[PDB]
Structures are given as C-alpha cells and as structure tokens.
Amino acid sequence: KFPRVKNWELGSITYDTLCAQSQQDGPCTPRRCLGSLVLPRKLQTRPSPGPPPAEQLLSQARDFINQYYSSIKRSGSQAHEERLQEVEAEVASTGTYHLRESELVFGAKQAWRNAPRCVGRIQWGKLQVFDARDCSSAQEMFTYICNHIKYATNRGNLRSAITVFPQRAPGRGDFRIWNSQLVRYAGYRQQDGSVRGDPANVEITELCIQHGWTPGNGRFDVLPLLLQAPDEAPELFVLPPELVLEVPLEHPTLEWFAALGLRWYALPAVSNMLLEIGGLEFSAAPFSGWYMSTEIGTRNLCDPHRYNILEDVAVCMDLDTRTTSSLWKDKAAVEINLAVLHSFQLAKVTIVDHHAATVSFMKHLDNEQKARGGCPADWAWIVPPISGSLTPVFHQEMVNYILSPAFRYQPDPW
Amino acid sequence: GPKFPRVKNWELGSITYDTLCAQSQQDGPCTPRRCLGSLVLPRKLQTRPSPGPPPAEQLLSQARDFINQYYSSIKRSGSQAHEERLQEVEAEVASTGTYHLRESELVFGAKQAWRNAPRCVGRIQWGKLQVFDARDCSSAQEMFTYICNHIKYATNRGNLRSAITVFPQRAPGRGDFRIWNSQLVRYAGYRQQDGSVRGDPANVEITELCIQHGWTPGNGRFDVLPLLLQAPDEAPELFVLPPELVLEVPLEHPTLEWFAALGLRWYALPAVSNMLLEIGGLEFSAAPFSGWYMSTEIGTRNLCDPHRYNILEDVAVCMDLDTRTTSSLWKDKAAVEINLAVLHSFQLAKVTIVDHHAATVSFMKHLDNEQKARGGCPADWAWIVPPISGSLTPVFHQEMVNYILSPAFRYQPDPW
Ligand code: HEM
Ligand code: HEM
Ligand SMILES: C[C@H](O)[C@H](O)[C@H]1CNc2nc(N)[nH]c(=O)c2N1
Ligand SMILES: C[C@H](O)[C@H](O)[C@H]1CNc2nc(N)[nH]c(=O)c2N1
Ligand SMILES: [Zn+2]
C-alpha cells in the first residue's frame, strides 16, 4: 500500500505514506507508466461549462480549511468549527467561497511545497505573498507585477515571491498573464525559416506584435507583457528597463567568451500556471525565486530548439567538432555553465549551481520524511540536465503524486 | 484523438501515439494515484523463484501467446503449422506440466526479449544477436565451457559481437541452473579493517561468497573474480577464467599524460549473467547475454559513482581544480576527462565502444523504426538518458512510454 523507497548511494530505505493523501490522479496506470510526459491533458486545469458541483467543491474546501487549522494547531478550536461553517454557508448559497488572506498565504506556500518538479523546495517556508485579489483591470495587474519584480529582484539579492490575482468565477472569463514568464526574450522568425532570439517565444512574440508592439531586432530583446482582464482583449505593457536586471555573460579565464555578446535576466518568474487552493483557482498568480545555473547555461543556451550555442562555443574553444567521441559538446557545455555561475557571482545576482541545489533538496527530502511521511517528486525534473549521477538526487528513488494545494498547467488563453 | 498515449518530442515538435502498450499483459508498479517510474526494483519487473510449477492454465495462455507471436513473425498466423504447433504445446503441458521450445522459437524469443527491454539504449542492434543454445548442458563444468566459448566469440579480440547463451529452463522436480555472479567479468571488492573497500564496492558480497567457496583472494583494485556456477540441486562450483580470455583496456588520456599513471582500467565485455529470460512462460534462470559498452557506463557510473570506484576527487586533484567549492564545477570537469579517457583508450586498443551521443542518436533511429514496425517502443526514460550530459543528447527531449512486454529479461532473487 506504501512504496518502499531506496537511496542506492547510501543504502537507506524509507516508506512514503504521504502518497495516500493524494486524491487527484496522475497519468500512469499499472499497464503503462507515463511519468516522462511533460503535460498529459488530464492533470491540466482547463476551462469549464459552468460552476463546479458544490459537493466536490466543499470536500476540497473542508480538507483545505482542515489543513490550515492543523497548521496553526487550532485543529478543533471553535475558530475551526466556525470557519468550516462560513465556507459551507458561502458555497451553499453562491456555489463558491473566498479565502482569508492568512489562508491564502498558507495555501501558496503549501502549493510550492507540494510541487513535485521543484528542486528548490527547501526554501518553501520562505515566500513573500502579495494579495492582488482587489484587481479589476489589466492596468492594475501591470502595477502589481511591476511591484512584484522590484521586490523580488532587490538589486540582485533575490527574494521568493508570488502575486495572486482574482480567482476564477463561473460567471466570467479569467484574469490571465499571456507571457509564460514575466521576463522573456523575443523570438523573430526571420525569412529563411530561422529564428533570431529565443525560439521558445516565437508565438508570444508574434502576439505582442499583432497587438501593436513595435518589434526590435536583437537576440535578447525583452518582450512587453500581454495582460488580460476578464472577457477583454489583452493589453500591451512595456516593462521599465530599470526593473529588468540582466547579466552579461563572461568566462573567468576565456577572454573571448564576453565577445559572444551573451546575457540572461536575473529573475525567473513563471506566469502561466494555475494556483489551486481548496478548490478555488487562481489563473493569474506569477511566482518567482532565483535560478539554478543549469536552467540558463544548459537548457536555455544549449538546447537545440533554444539559443543552441554549443557549436559556436566549441569552435571558439577550437574543439574537434568532427566526431561525437571528442566530447566537444560536453566540454563546451561545462564552460558555458561555468560562465553563467561566474557572471552572476560577479554581478552579485543570486544563483545556485546544480550541486548545491540538489544537496539541499536531499536535506529537504529528509525534513519532509520526518514532517509528513514523504515528499512528492518527479525524478526526471529533479535530476539536472548535465552531470546527473554526479549529483545525489540521481541515486535517490522518488515517488510522484499530486497533492493539493497545487500549481497546475492550464490552457493558453488565446 | 486516438485512445492511446500521445508521445511528444520537444526538440522536434513531432508527435506519435503508442499503440503497442495495448499488448502489455503484465502490470507495472504505477497507479493513477502515484508514479513509481524511478524505482530500480519495484516488485513488478522482478521474477521471484517458483518452487512450484506454474499452474498449467497460466502456463498455457502464456505459451499460446508466445506461439502466436512466433507464427505472426514468420507470417504464418492462422496456418496449419500454426494450429499444429499450438496443439503440440497444449499436449506437452497437458501430460508433463511443461513444454519445450523449438530451436528457431528460442532464437526469436531471445531477440524479442532484448527488443522488449525498456532499459536498454542499444536496441537498434536487436536483430543481430548470436544465440548459443546450451539447453543440453548437464553440469557445472559444462556451463563453464559454454561460458568460455561465449566470451571468446563475443570478445573476438576487440571486435565485439552481441551474444547470449541459454542454459536449460526451470523444471518441475529439479533445482535451477544459476550463475551466481552478476556479470561474467567482475572486479573483486575486498572489505577493509577500516570498513572501507579495496576494488569494486558493488561486488563485496560475491567476492565474499567466492572466498567462502574456497577462492584465494588477491588484494588489488582490479582483481577479476572467479565464477560461482550452479547446476540443479548441486552446490555451486568455483571456476577461474583464464586471463587470456578476459580482455582488459588500461586507461590513458589523449592529452593528460599523468592519467595513465593512475593505473586505471576496465574490461572489454559487458555480460549480464544474473537475469532471467522468460519466453512463453518458460523460465531460463541462466542465460548470460553480452554486447559492447557505452562509455558512460564505465567512465561515469562505474568509475565515478560515490558507491563505486569513486575517483572524481582523485582526478580533480590531478587537474588542480578547486575541490572545496561546488560552483567550480570540478566534478563536471573531471567526469568529462574520465569519459574521454575511456573512449580514447578503447579506441587506441581497438576494442568496441560507443559514446553516449552516438548511442542515443542511434536509439532515436530505433524509436522511429519501431514506431513503424510495432507502433511504439517501451522505454525507461531514467535509464535511457545518460548519467552525464543528459539534455545534450536527443533522448532527453523525447517523451517515453514504459511497459512490460513478453518475451522478457526479468530480475530474479539471489540464489543464496
Ligand atoms: C528559491 C529558488 C528556487 C529554485 C532554485 C527553484 C528551482 C526550480 C527548478 C530548477 C525548476 C525547473 C524549471 C524548468 O526546468 O523549467 C523549478 C520548477 C518549479 N518551481 Fe521551483 N525553484 C525555486 C523557487 C520557486 C518558487 C518561489 C516557487 C513557487 C512559489 C516555485 C515553484 C516551482 C514549480 C511550480 C515548478 C514547476 C514548473 C513547471 O512545471 O514548468 N519554485 N524550480
Ligand atoms: C550491443 C550493445 C549494447 C549496448 C550499447 C547496450 C547498452 C545498454 C546500457 C547502457 C544499458 C544500461 C546498463 C546499466 O546502466 O547498468 C543496458 C541495459 C540492458 N541491456 Fe543493453 N546494450 C547492448 C546490448 C545488449 C544485448 C545484446 C542485450 C541482450 C540480448 C541487452 C539487454 C539489456 C538489458 C535487459 C538491460 C537491462 C539490465 C538491467 O536492468 O540491469 N543489451 N544496455
Ligand atoms: C521529455 C522530457 O520529460 C522533458 O525533456 C523533460 C525532462 N526533464 C526536465 N527537467 C526540468 N527541470 N525541466 C524540463 O523542462 C525537463 N523536460
Ligand atoms: C534511483 C534511480 O532509479 C537509479 O539511480 C537509476 C537511474 N537511472 C539509471 N540508468 C541507467 N542506465 N542505469 C542505472 O543503474 C540507473 N539507476
Ligand atoms: Zn509512472
């Protein structure tokens, strides 16, 4: 009933009992495992043709309120009893309900804690939660967002934060941020099929232009935001450059690296996921932390479908690009990740390397085994994209499952 | 759309549907409530020992399914030979509780077991396998002869050739044929007074089993072990492989002159010998198989795992790296040079080896072939993606569907 979980480096064994608290089904079955798929349409939180059934909603809300009071140890207080009755009252008459701010703050931190793809969860207790539920216009969202970013960047001393915009309502369209992150580089599909900039952002770049943006022509042009208030066309907002802290990439010993003209932005802020707490859904709730260097040095700069700089750097290093067996790719990638760490350190911008980060996740796993009898984790996302078995999490068996509060994928608004 | 897993490649943006998983008849460890995909041995890929003969009715369904597979493969499904073969199997089981495979059925089943292996990145080679039929073997000393012949054929002086040797199947009223060793070539692991280990820590128990069975130990880092071989109902017997049959490669580096002085080496032939070959419900408890190495198996896992030869810090020190901080990427730097040494050394010695870029590129081609041939390919992402340079290889960006197809290579309990 409970998985036996082994760490093959240390020989230690634990049992995951927390997984019995899952109530949402993942994509696997006993007949085939789909653990490596990025998004099955299933766990995804898509639009609906009306208001959720009140029984389901109140089951999730009761469990959540139950989590909250257990969390402040008044589980069973009259406050508890009373809050449950308010929630019951509000659902039965309106089909929905509202969270108290302190509940929202607990719920956002628990959603991060529960995120099986996040290797940075040892920080989960440390999150600035901005309540933006009194927002009624795109213009307003922009102001809250600009405030998120100033707070979170903090001159390079990054601090984790989330801004929560108004929940989804049966009666209307959603508040959405169309960009997948608050900071994104444009991707221009020049004539010859090519792409200048970040190919991951060709479609959003196109939407921006189509919605009146005047495009640049560089490899790192920061896109404007497309922000959407319920049932209205999204509106275009250009971020103040002063708010977007960037790091030009240099290498500690290769002189010519700086000449590649490469850079990346300081703040990782995901803006297209849905935050679910107690059955309520926040379709606009951007969150940010700081980067793990492999995100930049390895995936964003060396993926074949991204900036794909591996061969340029190898040729620069005078590597033998003729055969696979010279390991030119491996060698170039190491230096590019080294350049990322060097540059952030030099610019005094928070960053964490993949060894430090996975070591801290191992400690986090230990903490959560004690605290809750397990930790949901997605092995393929937790092991880094370089040097996998050189890190401790490679040798660690992991159990993956969905707990709520949760961050979830949702359909693109367009 | 289709009622099958939709599978995407994120580098290429292409999509496929896996229909082959429909054929899966054995349940894995995952459920809608939680995924156990990252577990090495869930109790869903391991075959416990049958002290008793499998129930006739369970055996026959498994047998009929495999015989249908065989006749489909030679495109005589529904045929008179087909119906006749089925009948014969039902009679054999019907009177003796078991049955036996024709030679060409064994060859098909063995190649199919490899094709069906979700954790193997080398399956593009699956059609090319020398199948040694050793089902006449009747003693521990004969197994030894069969195995030496295997090694000589497979090794072929450095031009390696895939091969498997099949010993008699599990039989009701009879103990099992077993090779106690996990591979045909294993370096000794000697526990030290300090509690440390000299040699390969993965092999401590077998090293001690050998000793306990009368082997006289050495005290090197790379002492080849003797084979513990077991014929039915007999205690296992100790056999020493003549040195000349075990080809080894001393490791050197193409530009780092001092690396040779490290005195490192690895053997040329990867030959797994403790897995169970299952065909049509029949169980071959001893059926060693071999291919050639992918360089990361040696350079990354065997040499750099913390619980294996653990040489990262040694090599980093020689490269004069800052081993006192993580963000110098000293582990990453050293690993790369250790893997390059392995490739360089195997090439120089003209022993077959495949780097992890070439191997995963070839696996992508296999996935394409198999989509067409069978509408899918069961694959264990965590094992297929290499332990270094993961997203620098094509398989990282390919979603995969994992399931159990039979004929199969299965884990089985230790014989002791
Ligand atoms: C404090 C620093 C943190 C670090 C170093 C960090 C690290 C990571 C990494 C390496 C990933 C993978 C990203 C990718 O491959 O695209 C990620 C995923 C994730 N992080 Fe964290 N994390 C941290 C903070 C945050 C915070 C503040 C939250 C939420 C409140 C967050 C929630 C998540 C979620 C939901 C995912 C999955 C994203 C997806 O599915 O695309 N993390 N994090
Ligand atoms: C021709 C060369 C081949 C290549 C390069 C190759 C490569 C690999 C690799 C890298 C693994 C992972 C090993 C590990 O991490 O411990 C593996 C596993 C596997 N291979 Fe292949 N393979 C080859 C041939 C063979 C052949 C000939 C067979 C069988 C007929 C075989 C059957 C398997 C099986 C069943 C596994 C899984 C074993 C386990 O769970 O420990 N492979 N192979
Ligand atoms: C197909 C496969 O799941 C996909 O490439 C995953 C693998 N692991 C990953 N891990 C992280 N952290 N981020 C990713 O985007 C991915 N992509
Ligand atoms: C815990 C985890 O499943 C384990 O370390 C796996 C990961 N991937 C692997 N991949 C290969 N090829 N070989 C292995 O031994 C493993 N070990
Ligand atoms: Zn699974």
PDB file of C-alpha atoms in Angstrom, chain B residues 51-211:
ATOM      1  CA  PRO B  51       9.440 -23.519  -6.034  1.00  0.00           C
ATOM      2  CA  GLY B  52       6.339 -24.990  -7.722  1.00  0.00           C
ATOM      3  CA  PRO B  53       5.450 -25.405 -11.429  1.00  0.00           C
ATOM      4  CA  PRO B  54       3.329 -22.576 -12.810  1.00  0.00           C
ATOM      5  CA  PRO B  55      -0.376 -23.502 -12.979  1.00  0.00           C
ATOM      6  CA  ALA B  56      -0.991 -25.303 -16.254  1.00  0.00           C
ATOM      7  CA  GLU B  57      -3.701 -22.867 -17.232  1.00  0.00           C
ATOM      8  CA  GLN B  58      -1.474 -19.898 -16.521  1.00  0.00           C
ATOM      9  CA  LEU B  59       1.368 -21.557 -18.390  1.00  0.00           C
ATOM     10  CA  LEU B  60      -0.678 -22.371 -21.469  1.00  0.00           C
ATOM     11  CA  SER B  61      -2.087 -18.871 -22.021  1.00  0.00           C
ATOM     12  CA  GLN B  62       1.469 -17.513 -21.860  1.00  0.00           C
ATOM     13  CA  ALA B  63       2.631 -20.295 -24.156  1.00  0.00           C
ATOM     14  CA  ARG B  64      -0.167 -19.803 -26.679  1.00  0.00           C
ATOM     15  CA  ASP B  65       0.510 -16.074 -26.719  1.00  0.00           C
ATOM     16  CA  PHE B  66       4.185 -16.626 -27.420  1.00  0.00           C
ATOM     17  CA  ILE B  67       3.441 -19.212 -30.076  1.00  0.00           C
ATOM     18  CA  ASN B  68       1.059 -16.741 -31.710  1.00  0.00           C
ATOM     19  CA  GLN B  69       3.916 -14.243 -31.648  1.00  0.00           C
ATOM     20  CA  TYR B  70       6.266 -16.682 -33.306  1.00  0.00           C
ATOM     21  CA  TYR B  71       3.842 -17.542 -36.119  1.00  0.00           C
ATOM     22  CA  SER B  72       2.996 -13.873 -36.726  1.00  0.00           C
ATOM     23  CA  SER B  73       6.695 -13.090 -37.034  1.00  0.00           C
ATOM     24  CA  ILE B  74       7.177 -15.642 -39.802  1.00  0.00           C
ATOM     25  CA  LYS B  75       3.806 -14.565 -41.234  1.00  0.00           C
ATOM     26  CA  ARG B  76       2.047 -17.946 -40.943  1.00  0.00           C
ATOM     27  CA  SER B  77      -0.542 -16.879 -38.422  1.00  0.00           C
ATOM     28  CA  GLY B  78      -3.707 -18.991 -38.640  1.00  0.00           C
ATOM     29  CA  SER B  79      -1.850 -21.659 -40.614  1.00  0.00           C
ATOM     30  CA  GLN B  80      -1.907 -25.421 -40.269  1.00  0.00           C
ATOM     31  CA  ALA B  81       1.629 -25.435 -38.868  1.00  0.00           C
ATOM     32  CA  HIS B  82       0.431 -22.768 -36.508  1.00  0.00           C
ATOM     33  CA  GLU B  83      -2.603 -24.690 -35.278  1.00  0.00           C
ATOM     34  CA  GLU B  84      -0.496 -27.824 -35.114  1.00  0.00           C
ATOM     35  CA  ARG B  85       2.187 -26.187 -33.033  1.00  0.00           C
ATOM     36  CA  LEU B  86      -0.361 -24.841 -30.593  1.00  0.00           C
ATOM     37  CA  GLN B  87      -1.838 -28.308 -30.218  1.00  0.00           C
ATOM     38  CA  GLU B  88       1.539 -29.839 -29.501  1.00  0.00           C
ATOM     39  CA  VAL B  89       2.236 -27.331 -26.749  1.00  0.00           C
ATOM     40  CA  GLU B  90      -1.126 -27.976 -25.124  1.00  0.00           C
ATOM     41  CA  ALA B  91      -0.416 -31.692 -25.179  1.00  0.00           C
ATOM     42  CA  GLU B  92       3.121 -31.365 -23.755  1.00  0.00           C
ATOM     43  CA  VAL B  93       1.897 -29.220 -20.922  1.00  0.00           C
ATOM     44  CA  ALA B  94      -1.165 -31.457 -20.589  1.00  0.00           C
ATOM     45  CA  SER B  95       0.863 -34.557 -19.814  1.00  0.00           C
ATOM     46  CA  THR B  96       4.109 -33.285 -18.302  1.00  0.00           C
ATOM     47  CA  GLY B  97       3.080 -29.879 -16.931  1.00  0.00           C
ATOM     48  CA  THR B  98       5.672 -28.110 -19.079  1.00  0.00           C
ATOM     49  CA  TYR B  99       6.750 -27.794 -22.689  1.00  0.00           C
ATOM     50  CA  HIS B 100       9.833 -27.191 -24.830  1.00  0.00           C
ATOM     51  CA  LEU B 101      10.756 -24.626 -27.466  1.00  0.00           C
ATOM     52  CA  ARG B 102      11.892 -25.407 -30.997  1.00  0.00           C
ATOM     53  CA  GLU B 103      15.328 -24.009 -31.809  1.00  0.00           C
ATOM     54  CA  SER B 104      14.011 -21.220 -34.034  1.00  0.00           C
ATOM     55  CA  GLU B 105      11.447 -20.277 -31.397  1.00  0.00           C
ATOM     56  CA  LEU B 106      14.245 -19.827 -28.824  1.00  0.00           C
ATOM     57  CA  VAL B 107      16.227 -17.608 -31.222  1.00  0.00           C
ATOM     58  CA  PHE B 108      13.117 -15.488 -31.870  1.00  0.00           C
ATOM     59  CA  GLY B 109      12.171 -15.276 -28.213  1.00  0.00           C
ATOM     60  CA  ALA B 110      15.684 -14.245 -27.183  1.00  0.00           C
ATOM     61  CA  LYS B 111      15.923 -11.457 -29.776  1.00  0.00           C
ATOM     62  CA  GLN B 112      12.422 -10.370 -28.759  1.00  0.00           C
ATOM     63  CA  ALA B 113      13.379 -10.241 -25.052  1.00  0.00           C
ATOM     64  CA  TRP B 114      16.150  -7.772 -25.962  1.00  0.00           C
ATOM     65  CA  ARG B 115      13.878  -5.725 -28.266  1.00  0.00           C
ATOM     66  CA  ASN B 116      11.360  -5.568 -25.393  1.00  0.00           C
ATOM     67  CA  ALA B 117      13.917  -4.424 -22.773  1.00  0.00           C
ATOM     68  CA  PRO B 118      12.836  -0.909 -21.707  1.00  0.00           C
ATOM     69  CA  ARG B 119      16.144  -0.047 -20.001  1.00  0.00           C
ATOM     70  CA  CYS B 120      18.421  -0.827 -22.938  1.00  0.00           C
ATOM     71  CA  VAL B 121      19.631   2.070 -25.116  1.00  0.00           C
ATOM     72  CA  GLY B 122      21.360  -0.288 -27.520  1.00  0.00           C
ATOM     73  CA  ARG B 123      18.272  -1.915 -29.031  1.00  0.00           C
ATOM     74  CA  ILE B 124      18.902  -0.729 -32.567  1.00  0.00           C
ATOM     75  CA  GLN B 125      21.208  -3.806 -32.700  1.00  0.00           C
ATOM     76  CA  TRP B 126      18.430  -6.133 -31.567  1.00  0.00           C
ATOM     77  CA  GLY B 127      18.166  -8.060 -34.881  1.00  0.00           C
ATOM     78  CA  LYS B 128      21.851  -9.012 -34.677  1.00  0.00           C
ATOM     79  CA  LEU B 129      22.360 -11.437 -31.800  1.00  0.00           C
ATOM     80  CA  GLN B 130      24.251 -14.746 -31.792  1.00  0.00           C
ATOM     81  CA  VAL B 131      22.060 -17.179 -29.860  1.00  0.00           C
ATOM     82  CA  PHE B 132      24.043 -20.020 -28.273  1.00  0.00           C
ATOM     83  CA  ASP B 133      21.739 -22.917 -27.469  1.00  0.00           C
ATOM     84  CA  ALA B 134      23.128 -24.632 -24.372  1.00  0.00           C
ATOM     85  CA  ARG B 135      19.930 -26.444 -23.380  1.00  0.00           C
ATOM     86  CA  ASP B 136      21.833 -29.740 -23.374  1.00  0.00           C
ATOM     87  CA  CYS B 137      24.150 -28.554 -20.601  1.00  0.00           C
ATOM     88  CA  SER B 138      24.153 -31.074 -17.773  1.00  0.00           C
ATOM     89  CA  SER B 139      26.789 -29.950 -15.294  1.00  0.00           C
ATOM     90  CA  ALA B 140      28.602 -27.021 -13.695  1.00  0.00           C
ATOM     91  CA  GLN B 141      31.800 -27.804 -15.585  1.00  0.00           C
ATOM     92  CA  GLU B 142      29.930 -27.821 -18.893  1.00  0.00           C
ATOM     93  CA  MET B 143      28.391 -24.383 -18.145  1.00  0.00           C
ATOM     94  CA  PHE B 144      31.927 -23.174 -17.659  1.00  0.00           C
ATOM     95  CA  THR B 145      32.926 -24.458 -21.089  1.00  0.00           C
ATOM     96  CA  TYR B 146      29.861 -22.887 -22.637  1.00  0.00           C
ATOM     97  CA  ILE B 147      30.669 -19.549 -20.944  1.00  0.00           C
ATOM     98  CA  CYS B 148      34.287 -19.511 -22.041  1.00  0.00           C
ATOM     99  CA  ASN B 149      33.165 -20.172 -25.575  1.00  0.00           C
ATOM    100  CA  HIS B 150      30.681 -17.316 -25.187  1.00  0.00           C
ATOM    101  CA  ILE B 151      33.400 -14.981 -24.067  1.00  0.00           C
ATOM    102  CA  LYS B 152      35.728 -15.924 -26.879  1.00  0.00           C
ATOM    103  CA  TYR B 153      33.060 -15.485 -29.519  1.00  0.00           C
ATOM    104  CA  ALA B 154      31.675 -12.245 -28.071  1.00  0.00           C
ATOM    105  CA  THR B 155      35.049 -10.660 -27.450  1.00  0.00           C
ATOM    106  CA  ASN B 156      36.535 -11.575 -30.857  1.00  0.00           C
ATOM    107  CA  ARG B 157      39.768  -9.866 -29.928  1.00  0.00           C
ATOM    108  CA  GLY B 158      38.169  -6.442 -29.530  1.00  0.00           C
ATOM    109  CA  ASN B 159      35.697  -6.582 -32.454  1.00  0.00           C
ATOM    110  CA  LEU B 160      32.775  -7.340 -30.136  1.00  0.00           C
ATOM    111  CA  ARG B 161      29.688  -9.264 -31.195  1.00  0.00           C
ATOM    112  CA  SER B 162      26.412  -9.450 -29.257  1.00  0.00           C
ATOM    113  CA  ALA B 163      25.557 -12.846 -27.880  1.00  0.00           C
ATOM    114  CA  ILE B 164      23.553 -14.842 -25.381  1.00  0.00           C
ATOM    115  CA  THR B 165      23.952 -18.408 -24.115  1.00  0.00           C
ATOM    116  CA  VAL B 166      20.815 -20.205 -22.977  1.00  0.00           C
ATOM    117  CA  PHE B 167      21.065 -22.988 -20.352  1.00  0.00           C
ATOM    118  CA  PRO B 168      18.191 -25.423 -19.595  1.00  0.00           C
ATOM    119  CA  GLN B 169      14.970 -23.859 -18.353  1.00  0.00           C
ATOM    120  CA  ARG B 170      13.484 -24.169 -14.857  1.00  0.00           C
ATOM    121  CA  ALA B 171      11.958 -27.625 -14.476  1.00  0.00           C
ATOM    122  CA  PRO B 172       9.412 -29.023 -12.013  1.00  0.00           C
ATOM    123  CA  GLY B 173      11.098 -31.577  -9.723  1.00  0.00           C
ATOM    124  CA  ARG B 174      14.602 -30.158 -10.226  1.00  0.00           C
ATOM    125  CA  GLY B 175      16.723 -27.234  -8.921  1.00  0.00           C
ATOM    126  CA  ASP B 176      17.823 -24.299 -11.119  1.00  0.00           C
ATOM    127  CA  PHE B 177      20.800 -23.626 -13.318  1.00  0.00           C
ATOM    128  CA  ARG B 178      22.291 -20.400 -11.970  1.00  0.00           C
ATOM    129  CA  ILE B 179      25.313 -18.185 -12.422  1.00  0.00           C
ATOM    130  CA  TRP B 180      25.873 -16.594  -9.021  1.00  0.00           C
ATOM    131  CA  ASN B 181      27.906 -13.687 -10.421  1.00  0.00           C
ATOM    132  CA  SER B 182      26.004 -10.623 -11.709  1.00  0.00           C
ATOM    133  CA  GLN B 183      28.309 -10.273 -14.722  1.00  0.00           C
ATOM    134  CA  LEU B 184      30.804 -12.710 -16.304  1.00  0.00           C
ATOM    135  CA  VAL B 185      33.584 -10.209 -15.568  1.00  0.00           C
ATOM    136  CA  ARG B 186      33.576  -8.575 -12.098  1.00  0.00           C
ATOM    137  CA  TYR B 187      36.384  -6.850 -10.152  1.00  0.00           C
ATOM    138  CA  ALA B 188      36.862  -8.021  -6.575  1.00  0.00           C
ATOM    139  CA  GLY B 189      35.603  -5.859  -3.704  1.00  0.00           C
ATOM    140  CA  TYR B 190      37.610  -6.506  -0.507  1.00  0.00           C
ATOM    141  CA  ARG B 191      36.266  -5.143   2.757  1.00  0.00           C
ATOM    142  CA  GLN B 192      38.994  -3.437   4.799  1.00  0.00           C
ATOM    143  CA  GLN B 193      39.538  -3.422   8.555  1.00  0.00           C
ATOM    144  CA  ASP B 194      38.678   0.296   8.387  1.00  0.00           C
ATOM    145  CA  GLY B 195      35.371  -0.725   6.830  1.00  0.00           C
ATOM    146  CA  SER B 196      36.444   0.802   3.541  1.00  0.00           C
ATOM    147  CA  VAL B 197      36.603  -1.299   0.375  1.00  0.00           C
ATOM    148  CA  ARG B 198      39.508  -2.043  -1.951  1.00  0.00           C
ATOM    149  CA  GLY B 199      38.385  -2.726  -5.548  1.00  0.00           C
ATOM    150  CA  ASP B 200      34.713  -2.581  -6.602  1.00  0.00           C
ATOM    151  CA  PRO B 201      32.274  -1.997  -3.722  1.00  0.00           C
ATOM    152  CA  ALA B 202      29.366  -3.280  -5.847  1.00  0.00           C
ATOM    153  CA  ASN B 203      30.947  -6.730  -5.655  1.00  0.00           C
ATOM    154  CA  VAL B 204      31.544  -7.180  -1.951  1.00  0.00           C
ATOM    155  CA  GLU B 205      29.058  -9.987  -1.335  1.00  0.00           C
ATOM    156  CA  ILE B 206      30.015 -12.045  -4.350  1.00  0.00           C
ATOM    157  CA  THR B 207      33.720 -11.583  -3.532  1.00  0.00           C
ATOM    158  CA  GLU B 208      32.986 -12.961  -0.069  1.00  0.00           C
ATOM    159  CA  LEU B 209      30.804 -15.769  -1.457  1.00  0.00           C
ATOM    160  CA  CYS B 210      33.768 -16.790  -3.639  1.00  0.00           C
ATOM    161  CA  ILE B 211      36.136 -16.794  -0.682  1.00  0.00           C
TER     162      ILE B 211
END
